[PDB]
Amino acid sequence: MSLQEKLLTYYRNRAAIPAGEQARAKQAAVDICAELRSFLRAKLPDMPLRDMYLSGSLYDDLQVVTADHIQLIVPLVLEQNLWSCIPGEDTIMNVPGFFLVRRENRGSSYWDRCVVGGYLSPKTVADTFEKVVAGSINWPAIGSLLDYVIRPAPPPEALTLEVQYERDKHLFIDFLPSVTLGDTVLVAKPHRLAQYDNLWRLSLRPAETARLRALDQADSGCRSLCLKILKAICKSTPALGHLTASQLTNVILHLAQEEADWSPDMLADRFLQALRGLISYLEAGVLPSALNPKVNLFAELTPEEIDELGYTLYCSLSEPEVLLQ
Numbered sequence: 001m002s003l004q005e006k007l008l009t010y011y012r013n014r015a016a017i018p019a020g021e022q023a024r025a026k027q028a029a030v031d032i033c034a035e036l037r038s039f040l041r042a043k044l045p046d047m048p049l050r051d052m053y054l055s056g057s058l059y060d061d062l063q064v065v066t067a068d069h070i071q072l073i074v075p076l077v078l079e080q081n082l083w084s085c086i087p088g089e090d091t092i093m094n095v096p097g098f099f100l101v102r103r104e105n106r107g108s109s110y111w112d113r114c115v116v117g118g119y120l121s122p123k124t125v126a127d128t129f130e131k132v133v134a135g136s137i138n139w140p141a142i143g144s145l146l147d148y149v150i151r152p153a154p155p156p157e158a159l160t161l162e163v164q165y166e167r168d169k170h171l172f173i174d175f176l177p178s179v180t181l182g183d184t185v186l187v188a189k190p191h192r193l194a195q196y197d198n199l200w201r202l203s204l205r206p207a208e209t210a211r212l213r214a215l216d217q218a219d220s221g222c223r224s225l226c227l228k229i230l231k232a233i234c235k236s237t238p239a240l241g242h243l244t245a246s247q248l249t250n251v252i253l254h255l256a257q258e259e260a261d262w263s264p265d266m267l268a269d270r271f272l273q274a275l276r277g278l279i280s281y282l283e284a285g286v287l288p289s290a291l292n293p294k295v296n297l298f299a300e301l302t303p304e305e306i307d308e309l310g311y312t313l314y315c316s317l318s319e320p321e322v323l324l325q
């Protein structure tokens with residue numbers, strides 16, 4: 001077979017999620033989200049929140065192999081005049097793509113409770129909801145009308161709920177606290193390196209995936225399909241598991257800036273170009289975000305982890321078919 005054929009076979013048999021499993025898992029999330037809105041509205045009346053909503057690859061049809069996880073965004077309500085956010089490149093940590101949230105002026109905020117040293121801690125905010133998750137063993141049988149049973153995920157996933165549905169199906173929904181100041185959207189998703197775990201993370205995923213969708217919609221291209229193959233490959237081994245969806249998505253987006261033709265028959269050529277690009281970014285130890293160039297997406301990896309990834313992908317341009325096995 002030509003590489004083209006092996007790629008389509010790989011996507012079909014490995015990357016692609018069965019349309020049945022996919023939609024059913026999706027509905028489970030929708031069902032639980034709707035329930036969690038109502039119940040938590042009553043269980044946490046003091047907490048300034050917006051409506052919770054779903055987010056992630058499962059919601060965008062970019063999830064691969066199996067459908068088992070999705071994010072539940074928890075938007076905190078902040079008084080814009082009592083808080084300011086500071087871009088990481090302007091702090092002592094010097095981490096682009098990550099933010100401090102500083103308490104301002106006077107007034108009272110419910111969220112004053114999560115402030116330490118005059119800053120809103122993403123970890124302290126997380127601990128508030130780890131309590132809420134752990135406290136779910138006190139809840140009534142929510143969603144029991146549609147035969148769902150909500151249980152705290154097994155440790156250490158202190159922010160995850162586990163939804164079991166028909167039959168021996170499990171959907172893992174993790175709570176993700178989010179903060180909007182001005183037009184800056186931040187999520188409490190810790191920096192990989194622990195010395196940065198108290199910085200808020202700038203939300204880049206909605207813009208990345210929207211760009212991906214718009215580009216493929218315009219010409220029925222195979223950018224998304226190619227991405228899904230990569231995500232599936234990177235889920236195959238521990239080594240390649242240190243690569244993220246965001247990283248691979250931005251590899252694709254960068255290549256899309258150089259290549260306009262993403263016809264289905266160009267898939268194999270793009271897949272090779274994608275690997276070449278990935279190798280070059282690893283070589284340089286820098287993968288700039290396509291939508292926010294100031295942010296290096298490889299800055300959560302140690303230089304050794306980067307070198308080891310490069311070593312893992314060294315012969316991929318000459319033996320690409322090996323990745324699919």
Ligand SMILES: Nc1nc2c(ncn2[C@@H]2O[C@H](COP(=O)(O)OP(=O)(O)O)[C@@H](O)[C@H]2O)c(=O)[nH]1
Nearest residue numbers: 055056057062063071187189203204205206245
């Ligand atoms: N839903 C969501 N996830 C984010 C965001 N920022 C970072 N992430 C993280 O990125 C991951 C989800 O991205 P996703 O596209 O689903 O990757 P996938 O799990 O490989 O399919 C999770 O680990 C999230 O914690 C964000 O703004 N929204």
